[PDB]
Amino acid sequence: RRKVDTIKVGILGYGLSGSVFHGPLLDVLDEYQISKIMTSRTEEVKRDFPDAEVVHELEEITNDPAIELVIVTTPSGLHYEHTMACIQAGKHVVMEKPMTATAEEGETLKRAADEKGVLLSVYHNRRWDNDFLTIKKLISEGSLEDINTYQVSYNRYRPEVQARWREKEGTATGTLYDLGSHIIDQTLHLFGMPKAVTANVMAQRENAETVDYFHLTLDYGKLQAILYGGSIVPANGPRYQIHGKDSSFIKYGIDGQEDALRAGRKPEDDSWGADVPEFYGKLTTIRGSDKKTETIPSVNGSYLTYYRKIAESIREGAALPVTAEEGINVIRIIEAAMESSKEKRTIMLE
Amino acid sequence: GRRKVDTIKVGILGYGLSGSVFHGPLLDVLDEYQISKIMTSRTEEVKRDFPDAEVVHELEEITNDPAIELVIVTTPSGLHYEHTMACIQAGKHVVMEKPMTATAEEGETLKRAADEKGVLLSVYHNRRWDNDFLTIKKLISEGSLEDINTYQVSYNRYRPEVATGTLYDLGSHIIDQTLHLFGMPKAVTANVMAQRENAETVDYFHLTLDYGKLQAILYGGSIVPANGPRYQIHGKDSSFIKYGIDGQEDALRAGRKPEDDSWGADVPEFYGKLTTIRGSDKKTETIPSVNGSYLTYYRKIAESIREGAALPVTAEEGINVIRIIEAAMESSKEKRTIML
């Protein structure tokens, strides 16, 4: 039990994740101090964090006694090496998603972290998207009782195949890992693990080889969760269609916090994470013969909450906002989906 | 050879919902048809709607009548095979209510016998003349939906309280529309189940028809307070998204009959949205629906009988629908994809 200093943070990588999705959040929380960043982008780090030291080798973070938390935002195929070496040096770690290519590697990371007394969490921050927070509130207030169908669609319009290096390079490529993990994580958070996965996973784009289409069925008995996304979709349809015994929630659109971060905006006030009114979800409730329909203002998105929560886990022993086991379960779903599509059969989870 | 064209003399089997509401009123407005006979026990309802038709109780009274040319079979599911096979044996043309039969094997035999005797066999897949689907057909033919990669169709309802169940009953309409647009898929993956408490018949289905690059998703549940779009269609530069249901069956239930150009009109609020992308410009356009037109089905049958024209729906088309259903049922039971 000591003086509560700023948490001393090392960031690995300063590309998109590091510089747009993580750095700007940590910068507004004074729980944190960014001490070091492993990156070649020196001029970029100086502009954003005039007092952070830029370093170039992993050991400069890992072997620095002063650093307590490492954010791992480097390319997919370095995730495991970097995180493991952070764990071994006794640092707490936040990993970008997808956690790893396989459940087994995930298992191994979690085991090392518990052995070494350190905190390991995965940046599944779509639990704090405006739309999802809204679904959760609706659930907790009894407006979506006994869900029987849960359909989530994560479509994009990117019909053109990028460069080989961006397509093929590294572990865990494609939209199932990249986009699917968000909405799979949301599903596990709401419902726990299913009995079975059925899935079609493919590249629809001409000359694509890496995955650009997925359609997952998660079997929870009476409850069906259907998770899907294509890369040739000019307009999306609802992002969520949720049916309960008495009510439905249908909602379009995507959380706007990532766009605000890309634009140079920081969570500076209460208007952060606000949804756009024409994209508010519509709730339909049926009471006997009476059918009503009502537009729900979304709860504000709140990515800050993940890091405020991480600070509480580090400083006060609170439960982590996203655990290692939660991270792993998502990877389990993905591997079962990948095997389902290959074997052309339903894969039981054991 | 060619002779005087008087009315096609029709016999209707059954006079419940199908006969009295879905077929009789259509037939009644068309001068090409005359209803001579109806196998039913609802004498008084027939006397009311068709004052000049003779009512009958057993099937032989229609099948052994040389004057009867066409038989509309609107009896229950399990009676389809027997009644139709009897009509064929008697040299009558037949319109079968959907779903055709329970098994493809049963359908093939009806088809093979219809051909041997020399008569026309059709299945009443009138959802090809639903307003939304006609609107999709038009969009396709004018090239507004090129290179379809994803075709998602939902047919939900809210009935939380309880060839059976919804795959046969509802699924067949949208399976048929899919086959009409795309032909036969390579494979069918499906979950087909009973979601309601104490349910004993299929009330939920989720089908994937695999066409390669193209994926067709056909689904429906029975505990759905609000629907979501009925059609989501995506192609290389455009999507079409539409809500709502064709309102012809409702106008028929209300006792209205096709009489002016306003039959089958959609409600503007449910017109589809067509979205098109040109580089960075995203453009969205509300598409007024083509008027639904169930009459077209019987005008077509008339021309087939009188003029040798192609049937509006062929026996083979109906059998293919059943093939998909049997395949979905097997997929669901076996927990695997079924190759066709």
- Look up the CATH number of the domain holding residue A335: 3.30.360.10
For B86-100, give the DSSP string: HHHHTT-EEEEPSS-
A126 phi, psi to nearest 5 deg: -65, 0
User: What distances in angstroms separate CA A43 from CA A51, A73, B253, one per listed residue?
Assistant: 12, 18, 73
Among B120, B337, B117, B144, which Cα is nearest to B236's? B144
What is residue B333's DSSP assignment?
H
Which stretch of DSSP H or E encloses residue A152?
A: strand A149-153
Is B1 among the domain residues?
Answer: no
Please give the residue range of the domain that contains residue B118: 6-125+294-310
Question: Distance from B198 to chain A by nearest Cα, in Å?
Answer: 12
| Residue A338, number of CB atoms within 10 A of its CB | 19
User: What distances in angstroms separate CA A97 from CA A29, A126, A176, B44, B103, one per listed residue?
Assistant: 22, 11, 12, 71, 48
Question: Distance from B213 to chain A by nearest Cα, in Å?
Answer: 5
Residues with Cβ within 8 Å of A105's Cβ and at least 6 positions away in sequence, in order, are A80
For residue A30, the SS3 value is coil
C-alpha B13/C-alpha A207 separation (Å) is 55
C-alpha A320/C-alpha B191 separation (Å) is 37
C-alpha A296/C-alpha A18 separation (Å) is 33
- Look up the CATH number of the domain holding residue A41: 3.40.50.720
Is B13 among the domain residues?
Answer: yes
Residues with Cβ within 8 Å of A63's Cβ and at least 6 positions away in sequence, in order, are A89
Q: How was this model experimentally determined? A: X-ray
| Residues B142, B78 share a domain | no
| Residues B173, B26 share a domain | no
Q: In whole angstroms, how large is the CA radius of gyration of chain A? A: 21
Residue A240 CA from chain centroid, whole number = 17
Q: Indicate the number of domains in chain B.
A: 2
| Residues A229, A276 share a domain | yes
> Cis link prior to A159 (omega < 30° from 0)?
no
Interface mutation target, options A207, A223, A226, A241, chain B, most CBs of B under 10 Å: A241
Among B290, B182, B177, which Cα is nearest to B235's? B182
**Residue the block writes with tokens 């024209």:** B309
| Residue A44, number of CB atoms within 10 A of its CB | 17
C-alpha A348/C-alpha B15 separation (Å) is 48
Residues with Cβ within 8 Å of B249's Cβ and at least 6 positions away in sequence, in order, are B21, B22
Among A158, A168, A159, which Cα is nearest to A210's? A168
Angle of the B315-334 helix axis to the B104-117 helix axis, nearest 10: 170
| Residues A258, A135 share a domain | yes
C-alpha A85/C-alpha A191 separation (Å) is 34
| Residues B305, B315 share a domain | no
| Residues A345, A218 share a domain | yes
| Residues A159, A92 share a domain | no
| Residues A350, A213 share a domain | yes
- Paired with B329 in beta bridges are none
Among B119, B69, B118, B126, which Cα is nearest to B97's? B126
Q: Are A138 and A296 in contact (CB under 8 A)?
A: yes
For residue B228, the SS3 value is coil
Q: Are B176 and B182 in contact (CB under 8 A)?
A: no
Interface mutation target, options B224, B287, B332, B334, chain A, most CBs of A under 10 Å: B224
> Cis link prior to B76 (omega < 30° from 0)?
no
User: What distances in angstroms separate CA A167 from CA A104, A327, A335, B9, one per listed residue?
Assistant: 24, 24, 19, 66
Determine, for residues A241 and B221 on separate chains, whether the beta-carbon distance falls below 8 Å.
no
Question: Distance from A142 to chain B by nearest Cα, in Å?
Answer: 15
Among A25, A135, A134, which Cα is nearest to A69's? A25
Q: Which residues of A touch B225 (CB under 8 A)?
A: 243-244, 246-248, 284-286, 291
| Residues A53, A194 share a domain | no
Give this entry's resolution in angstroms: 2.6
Q: Which residues of A touch B282 (CB under 8 A)?
A: 234
